């Protein structure tokens, strides 16, 4: 795949980061093993995350320098809100 995911610094323009953090615990099958991941379901191409560089349909690996891997639906959101009026969303670029 790729190494060193590039964090996209969004900036809350007095409203929101303009993107949906879809939570999805990817199970490996019938077993209890699963990874708690998240993906931007929809990013508002009107100012925030989109203009920042966040391309819709990307998988978030880290947030503000904190692995999202294992964070619950609201934990990622909080991690972002916690950052302040902005946040470094680490997404996974394309790969062969």
């Amino acid at each position: 795949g790729g190494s060193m995911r590039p964090p996209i610094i969004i900036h809350r323009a007095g409203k929101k980061y303009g993107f949906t953090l879809r939570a999805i615990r990817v199970y490996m099958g019938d077993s209890d093993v699963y990874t708690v991941h998240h993906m931007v379901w929809h990013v508002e191409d009107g100012g925030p995350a989109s203009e920042a560089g966040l391309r819709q349909g990307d998988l978030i690996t880290h947030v503000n320098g904190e692995p999202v891997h294992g964070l619950v639906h609201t934990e990622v959101v909080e991690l972002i809100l916690k950052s302040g009026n902005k946040v470094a969303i680490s997404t996974t670029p394309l790969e062969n």
């Binding site: 949906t20 990817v26 199970y27 708690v36 995350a49 619950v72 609201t74 959101v77 809100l81």
Partner: peptide
Amino acid sequence: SWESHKSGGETRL
């Protein structure tokens, strides 16, 4: 793969 789409709602930023 894919499960928590409803588990937690549809909270966004």
